[PDB]
């Protein structure tokens, strides 16, 4: 009769406002803005960088990215427990009448 | 369990152990989605931008 | 996500000038990405420094950059009358936008 | 992923059909299958190393069996 | 021997949409980034345009995140730049700029001279 | 002569705005607005009701 | 985020009629906490039943209630003519908080 | 036997702030929390109250978390209100409210009846 839905999953997304941000050699992590959120998905990673890419000390730098979580498509796992529930039983007797 | 217009009935252990990133029944207002990372990925094919 | 250099600056033809812009530790102390731009009251600005010190073709080797941590020198030597231009600070930041400066007025007397 | 552990052995079965059997009942040794006659040579080592190993004469066979099972 | 004209505007409404484009020749356009900043009179210079390519990604400027739309084109080598529901801040002079483009299709890491070259100012004034 | 900064710690804290959530048993977790904020501590444990 | 009986009701005496009201998995979905309150007009508001059917002491038996999952309801069996007063609900959240209904004043003609 | 008395406020002018008093009376003013609910004037019952105990603790709305604070003093067995910065829509008659706190002395969870004892009802105004 009354379920109450305990765990939702979700099967489609789509990720929004993603973003980058990346820092020099040796001196520490990256930190964005909206990681924060814990709507936006986070990886922490290392690129290579160098004079080229503006920094210097010619190594491994590190880098962060984020983009928001939003959802399109759930399930609802719904549970109930072994009270307000009802079995529909039909008991008809023989000597048959026309069809 | 209930998607988009079916419904099944499985098993209770089986269905916390599933990966996906869920959210509680309660929970209104659903931005807080727990383990994202199970439906992104992060491509860094080089050592390069990712 | 701006620039602190100051309003205006003077100097007599034959001194130097300097031109210092504090920046935070993500955009300017830490990148080498600090450009600077002067602007003629009737013309569109134009490229005058490359990443640090370094120069485009045009402009006739006067001019020198410096970073010292968090601030971003633009040393003038041998000032003329016709260097009465707004000279913009530059820095591409961290997160990936570009901040700029308020603005500097030269003159000489 | 979620098409790995297809929800089989739980029990809960009834006398009314799943959402997909007489599908998904053939569909494992259909695909070990078609994977050997696509990859062979695995099978042929597999036949070396399980005949070298495991002394008596169906520790071969069990041993070749859950070696071309395992590597799909 | 590189030149950025410019497209002009007359008068707008705070409300309506301005509009103003870049015709850019002499080089090739299909592997390069274009920007656009406004400059208020004396003041400083605000970066409303994004990183155009040859495909025309995006880079959300904060100040201008959900008022202004962006396009591009190809096949007459020009960038187009629209701001919708201006107000009485907006009325400023426009540039353009020139930045190259990684190899590999991608731009996000900027190269070491950026803004080579750039427009030559069309008005807007609101009324 | 010129130092860059590589990892700040925190030495001493202090805590506002408590706020707790707590439900029936058998019924999945708690969701609180705050747990989507990250200067927010959070953990789940079990009272019994 | 209030809950949502309706406007009023009406009764003539002798009937049994019923005031509902529904709410969220927080409110009334989960929790056994839902209460209403009797008010007449010119005095405080005073309770009818408590946790979900139970009753204090003065209150007569006429009172009772039950809950549907996200929905409460307030049976009154055999109106009587004091019965004109608006009866309002309430709950408990998962949150900490308290909500009261809008208020469904019932009349008995 | 249980009495709970309040004291009325005549009219308050709009940023003046407004305190109203319930002398609590027949019980252990230390074992039992101090809920406050108001109404406008047929309108509904919405909870300004927070959760007193021989702690002096707080559990304020959501609306208005901002807006209100307490003050409290057992040796006179009554409980205080201060609403601050009154406003034009806050006409409205304030009710006294009573709970149980538990037996180790917080209020963690409310007992399963809530208002068995009420109070009189303090009426402001705007002017
Ligand atoms: C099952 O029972 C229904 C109910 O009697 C049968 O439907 C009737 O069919 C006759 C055919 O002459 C009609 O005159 C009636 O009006 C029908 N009653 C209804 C629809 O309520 C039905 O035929 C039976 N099925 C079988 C296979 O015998
Ligand atoms: C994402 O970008 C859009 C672009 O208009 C903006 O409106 C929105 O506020 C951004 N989201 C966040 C969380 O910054
Ligand atoms: C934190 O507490 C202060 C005072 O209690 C309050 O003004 C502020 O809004 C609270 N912060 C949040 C995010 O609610």
């Given at each position: 009769?009354?379920?109450?839905?305990?765990?939702?999953?979700?099967?489609?997304?789509?990720?929004?406002?993603?973003?980058?941000?990346?820092?020099?050699?040796?001196?520490?992590?990256?930190?964005?803005?909206?990681?924060?959120?814990?709507?936006?998905?986070?990886?922490?990673?290392?690129?290579?960088?160098?004079?080229?890419?503006?920094?210097?000390?010619?190594?491994?730098?590190?880098?962060?990215?984020?983009?928001?979580?939003?959802?399109?498509?759930?399930?609802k796992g719904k549970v109930v427990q072994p009270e307000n529930l009802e079995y529909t039983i039909v008991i008809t007797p023989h000597s048959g009448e026309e069809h | 369990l209930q998607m988009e217009n079916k419904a099944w009935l499985v098993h209770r252990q089986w269905f916390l152990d599933?990966?996906?990133?869920?959210?509680?029944?309660?929970?209104?207002?659903?931005?807080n989605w727990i383990q994202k990372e199970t439906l992104v990925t992060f491509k860094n094919p080089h050592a390069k931008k990712q | 996500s701006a620039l602190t250099q100051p309003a205006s600056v003077s100097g007599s033809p034959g001194q130097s000038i300097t031109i210092s812009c504090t920046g935070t530790s993500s955009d300017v102390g830490g990148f080498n990405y600090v450009s600077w731009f002067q602007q003629h009251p009737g013309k569109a600005p134009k490229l005058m420094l490359y990443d640090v010190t370094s120069r485009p073709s045009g402009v006739s080797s006067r001019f020198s950059g410096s970073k010292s941590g968090n601030?971003?020198?633009?040393?003038?030597?041998?000032?003329?009358?016709?260097?009465?231009?707004?000279?913009?600070?530059?820095?591409?930041?961290?997160?990936?936008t570009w901040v700029f400066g308020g603005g500097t007025k030269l003159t000489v007397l | 992923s979620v098409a790995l552990v297809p929800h089989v052995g739980m029990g809960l079965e009834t006398r009314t059909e799943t959402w997909m059997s007489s599908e998904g009942a053939?569909?494992?040794?259909?695909?070990?299958?078609?994977?050997?006659?696509?990859?062979?040579?695995?099978?042929?080592?597999?036949?070396?190393?399980?005949?070298?190993?495991?002394?008596?004469?169906?520790?071969?066979?069990?041993?070749?069996?859950?070696?071309?099972?395992?590597?799909? | 021997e590189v030149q950025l004209v410019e497209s002009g505007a007359e008068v707008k409404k705070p409300g309506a949409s301005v509009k103003v484009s870049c015709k850019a020749s002499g080089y090739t356009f299909t592997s390069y980034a274009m920007h656009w900043?406004?400059?208020?009179?004396?003041?400083?210079?605000?970066?409303?345009?994004?990183?155009?390519?040859?495909?025309?990604?995006?880079?959300?400027?904060?100040?201008?995140?959900?008022?202004?739309?962006?396009?591009?084109?190809?096949?007459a080598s020009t960038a187009y730049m629209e701001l919708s529901s201006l107000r009485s801040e907006d009325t400023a002079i426009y540039y353009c700029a020139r930045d190259k483009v990684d190899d590999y299709g991608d731009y996000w890491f900027p190269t070491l001279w950026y803004f080579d070259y750039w427009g030559q100012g069309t008005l807007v004034t609101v009324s």
């Open positions: 009769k009354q379920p109450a839905t305990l765990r939702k999953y979700c099967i489609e997304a789509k990720l929004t406002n993603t973003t980058t941000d990346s820092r020099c050699p040796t001196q520490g992590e990256p930190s964005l803005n909206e990681e924060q959120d814990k709507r936006f998905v986070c990886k922490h990673s290392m690129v290579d960088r160098g004079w080229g890419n503006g920094c210097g000390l010619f190594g491994k730098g590190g880098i962060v990215t984020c983009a928001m979580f939003t959802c399109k498509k759930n399930m | 599933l990966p996906l990133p869920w959210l509680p029944g309660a929970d209104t207002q659903g931005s | 601030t971003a020198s633009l040393t003038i030597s041998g000032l003329q009358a016709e260097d009465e231009a707004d000279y913009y600070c530059s820095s591409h930041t961290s997160r990936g | 053939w569909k494992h040794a259909q695909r070990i299958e078609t994977w050997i006659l696509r990859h062979p040579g695995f099978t042929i080592m597999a036949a070396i190393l399980a005949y070298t190993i495991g002394t008596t004469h169906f520790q071969r066979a069990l041993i070749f069996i859950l070696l071309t099972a395992v590597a799909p | 900043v406004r400059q208020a009179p004396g003041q400083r210079l605000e970066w409303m345009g994004w990183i155009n390519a040859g495909n025309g990604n995006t880079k959300y400027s904060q100040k201008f995140q959900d008022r202004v739309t962006i396009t591009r084109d190809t096949s």
